[PDB]
Amino acid sequence: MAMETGLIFHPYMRPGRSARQTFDWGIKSAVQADSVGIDSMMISEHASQIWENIPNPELLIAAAALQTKNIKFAPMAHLLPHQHPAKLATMIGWLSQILEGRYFLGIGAGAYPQASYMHGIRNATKNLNDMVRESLFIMEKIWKREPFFHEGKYWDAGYPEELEDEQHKLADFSPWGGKAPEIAVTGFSYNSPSMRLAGERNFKPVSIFSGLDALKRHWEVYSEAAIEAGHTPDRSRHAVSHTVFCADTDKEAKRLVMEGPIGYCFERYLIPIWRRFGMMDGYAKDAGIDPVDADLEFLVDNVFLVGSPDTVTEKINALFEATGGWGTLQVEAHDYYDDPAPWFQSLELISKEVAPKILLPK
Amino acid sequence: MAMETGLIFHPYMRPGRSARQTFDWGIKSAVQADSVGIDSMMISEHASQIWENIPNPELLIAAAALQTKNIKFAPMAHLLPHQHPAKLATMIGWLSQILEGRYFLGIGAGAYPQASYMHGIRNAGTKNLNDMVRESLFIMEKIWKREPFFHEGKYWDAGYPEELEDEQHKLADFSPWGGKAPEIAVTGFSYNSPSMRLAGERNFKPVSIFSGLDALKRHWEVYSEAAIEAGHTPDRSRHAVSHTVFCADTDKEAKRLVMEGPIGYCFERYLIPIWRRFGMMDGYAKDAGIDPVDADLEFLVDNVFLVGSPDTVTEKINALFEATGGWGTLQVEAHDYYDDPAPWFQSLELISKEVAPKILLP
Numbered sequence: 001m002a003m004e005t006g007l008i009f010h011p012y013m014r015p016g017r018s019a020r021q022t023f024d025w026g027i028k029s030a031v032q033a034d035s036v037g038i039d040s041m042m043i044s045e046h047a048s049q050i051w052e053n054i055p056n057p058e059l060l061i062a063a064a065a066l067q068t069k070n071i072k073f074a075p076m077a078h079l080l081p082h083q084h085p086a087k088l089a090t091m092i093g094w095l096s097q098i099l100e101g102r103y104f105l106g107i108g109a110g111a112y113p114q115a116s117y118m119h120g121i122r123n124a125t126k127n128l129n130d131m132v133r134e135s136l137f138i139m140e141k142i143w144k145r146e147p148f149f150h151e152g153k154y155w156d157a158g159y160p161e162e163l164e165d166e167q168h169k170l171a172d173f174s175p176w177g178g179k180a181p182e183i184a185v186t187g188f189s190y191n192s193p194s195m196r197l198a199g200e201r202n203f204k205p206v207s208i209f210s211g212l213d214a215l216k217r218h219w220e221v222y223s224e225a226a227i228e229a230g231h232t233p234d235r236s237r238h239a240v241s242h243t244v245f246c247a248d249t250d251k252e253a254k255r256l257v258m259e260g261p262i263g264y265c266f267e268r269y270l271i272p273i274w275r276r277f278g279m280m281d282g283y284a285k286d287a288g289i290d291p292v293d294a295d296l297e298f299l300v301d302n303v304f305l306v307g308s309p310d311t312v313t314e315k316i317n318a319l320f321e322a323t324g325g326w327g328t329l330q331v332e333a334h335d336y337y338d339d340p341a342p343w344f345q346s347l348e349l350i351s352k353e354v355a356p357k358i359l360l361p362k
Numbered sequence: 363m364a365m366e367t368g369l370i371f372h373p374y375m376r377p378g379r380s381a382r383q384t385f386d387w388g389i390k391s392a393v394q395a396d397s398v399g400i401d402s403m404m405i406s407e408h409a410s411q412i413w414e415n416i417p418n419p420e421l422l423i424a425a426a427a428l429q430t431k432n433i434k435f436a437p438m439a440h441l442l443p444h445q446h447p448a449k450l451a452t453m454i455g456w457l458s459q460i461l462e463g464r465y466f467l468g469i470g471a472g473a474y475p476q477a478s479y480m481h482g483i484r485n486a487g488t489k490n491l492n493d494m495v496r497e498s499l500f501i502m503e504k505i506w507k508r509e510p511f512f513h514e515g516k517y518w519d520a521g522y523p524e525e526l527e528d529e530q531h532k533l534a535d536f537s538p539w540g541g542k543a544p545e546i547a548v549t550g551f552s553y554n555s556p557s558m559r560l561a562g563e564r565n566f567k568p569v570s571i572f573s574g575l576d577a578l579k580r581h582w583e584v585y586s587e588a589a590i591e592a593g594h595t596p597d598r599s600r601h602a603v604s605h606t607v608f609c610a611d612t613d614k615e616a617k618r619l620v621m622e623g624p625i626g627y628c629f630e631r632y633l634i635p636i637w638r639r640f641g642m643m644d645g646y647a648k649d650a651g652i653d654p655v656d657a658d659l660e661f662l663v664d665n666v667f668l669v670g671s672p673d674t675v676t677e678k679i680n681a682l683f684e685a686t687g688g689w690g691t692l693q694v695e696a697h698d699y700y701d702d703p704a705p706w707f708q709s710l711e712l713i714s715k716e717v718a719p720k721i722l723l724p
């Protein structure tokens with residue numbers, strides 16, 4: 001029935017944050033989210049960025065695994081071109097086992113050429129999408145634990161035969177229940193190749209909210225690819241990422257956003273980038289304004305899901321009418337490490353008072 | 363000063379233990395060792411083994427990081443041929459940062475062909491594992507330095523990018539704590555150890571598995587000669603030596619707890635048949651004047667293992683020190699006491715607080 005609440009931890013940590021502080025904020029976020037019934041926590045991967053400063057989401061997932069009871073974790077995404085697929089497959093399976101299946105897997109190519117370069121991919125010639133395909137092909141076969149060898153374009157890998165007593169046969173690091181984890185992919189462009197791939201393979205679709213047109217287009221491409229490949233598209237699997245903040249009143253919610261960590265990140269970091277690459281055009285069209293006038297207050301008033309629980313509940317209901325809805329509201333985590341209380345109260349309000357009222361039509 | 367106490371967590375988990383139980387035991391082990399002043403915890407890496415069932419020691423280190431105050435962690439060892447070196451270098455630096463330098467790095471080739479095969483290396487003991495170790499380390503040290511390069515190697519492509527042409531837009535810094543390579547360790551097992559020679563040449567930390575008096579002395583001979591020849595001053599206090607060690611109130615109950623507990627079980631079921639098949643108890647047999655064919659559990663408990671009361675163990679260590687010159691860290695092998703850890707925890711407290719402080723290094 002009800003739309004779930006999720007957390008996406010990019011993260012967006014203020015420049016100057018230490019690794020220990022970031023890791024601490026991640027574990028506290030996992031524990032708090034689990035405590036208020038948030039369904040899932042996605043954790044991103046970057047080796048070359050300042051704000052998005054987690055190069056190994058699996059370390060955080062592992063650190064929070066036995067400190068949580070119900071929440072599911074997902075790297076979003078492991079960048080398949082950057083790792084040996086056998087090493088990655090084994091880790092994925094083992095971590096899935098540790099979590100007793102409270103796990104799913106995000107895969108991706110990587111959008112940052114500086115980081116592609118570090119991992120030996122120049123002019124991001126090798127093809128990152130082909131690397132993704134070959135890695136996944138390999139990992140799926142390692143999880144099956146049937147012998148094979150593969151001399152690939154990008155990697156060599158295999159699964160060995162047993163040597164000629166339980167203690168002497170091969171380890172079993174297949175994911176929980178002995179099968180592949182549920183796999184997810186994120187889409188950003190309007191006509192998303194990733195959405196197409198996901199429908200084709202029956203993967204979990206993940207969108208970053210960039211306007212009504214793009215959201216509709218993502219589900220259009222995904223469902224048609226799915227039905228064509230013989231799958232039944234399920235809206236409840238669709239996760240959509242939003243900037244969301246809740247407080248007792250609209251006035252306090254807007255103020256806390258405008259004056260705190262969220263407004264600070266947008267003003268200092270995200271807006272200049274989004275403006276330079278015209279990424280607020282979908283927002284501008286939706287609201288009828290000119291992209292040149294897309295500022296923090298415009299976003300807070302027309303884009304972000306900000307207000308009292310009632311105001312936020314209404315805004316989500318509106319989007320649902322316009323789009324058809326989605327399965328998980330994936331709340332973007334911001335740097336409240338120094339001021340946890342209003343952020344935790346906000347998440348608690350979303351998970352317990354907002355999301356349960358939002359019902360899926362499909 | 364005093365000889366330090368260390369823990370080595372291979373692990374040796376009874377066949378049938380789940381990934382969750384293994385992970386839980388590792389974290390509980392790290393916390394308890396920290397609480398009784400154990401200096402370091404080494405965690406091994408295997409993808410194909412049953413008893414030694416941790417394919418990603420860094421996950422356990424990360425999970426124990428914020429739960430401990432003083433203990434230092436090391437993967438022992440990361441198998442360099444199995445990972446992209448840029449991905450591995452980045453993880454090592456970030457984890458070193460999270461731990462605020464309570465970290466050091468074991469590297470190795472890998473001694474299990476079934477696991478080598480998984481990672482694309484056929485006919486392991488064609489690609490050369492030691493050459494793979496060299497190229498990986500060459501790359502990782504340059505990534506930690508954060509100076510631009512690109513390397514087109516025999517086994518990997520990797521590099522470090524130039525900054526693009528505001529702090530928030532500069533490259534991330536995932537260099538290890540203090541901006542320098544971590545201290546690097548290698549383990550030796552064979553009599554005339556190439557690993558001991560390499561460690562000497564490069565001023566790495568030597569780690570030996572105790573296999574008899576002659577090998578222990580040969581290890582230090584090979585290491586020191588390589589060290590002096592390369593122009594370093596060999597330091598015995600950096601030498602770590604792994605022993606099977608159990609302490610109790612009296613010699614009688616210490617022996618009984620070993621014979622009748624997890625340690626005796628692992629040795630009887632798993633280790634002894636292997637060691638006997640590959641003549642690995644010949645050094646022990648030579649030492650005690652018996653024939654290898656007569657090496658069984660009780661022989662090991664009586665003449666090899668460091669077992670008894672605090673005084674008996676202290677005297678046994680002194681005899682070894684007089685015979686070999688000694689070592690800096692007594693690396694205690696962790697066994698599967700997850701079901702009933704009280705006598706194991708007490709033993710570790712006795713070793714760390716009552717035994718080791720009395721052993722000084724000449």
Ligand SMILES: Cc1cc2nc3c(=O)[nH]c(=O)nc-3n(C[C@H](O)[C@H](O)[C@H](O)COP(=O)(O)O)c2cc1C
Pocket residue numbers: 010044076077106107108109111185186187188189190191192193194195208
């Ligand atoms: C604001 C923003 C956030 C993003 N977050 C993620 C993320 O969390 N995980 C991820 O794998 N990719 C992320 N991306 C990159 C896109 O998901 C990537 O381009 C996509 O996988 C490929 O898009 P397409 O196939 O729709 O062209 C993000 C991009 C933007 C602009």
Ligand SMILES: Cc1cc2nc3c(=O)[nH]c(=O)nc-3n(C[C@H](O)[C@H](O)[C@H](O)COP(=O)(O)O)c2cc1C
Pocket residue numbers: 370372406438439468469470471473548549550551552553554555556557558571
């Ligand atoms: C009982 C036993 C325990 C071992 N434990 C470890 C270990 O904890 N870490 C490791 O890197 N290698 C371990 N090894 C493998 C040896 O370290 C390996 O032979 C060595 O790295 C290469 O030795 P050499 O260069 O002297 O031939 C172990 C081997 C045996 C037989």
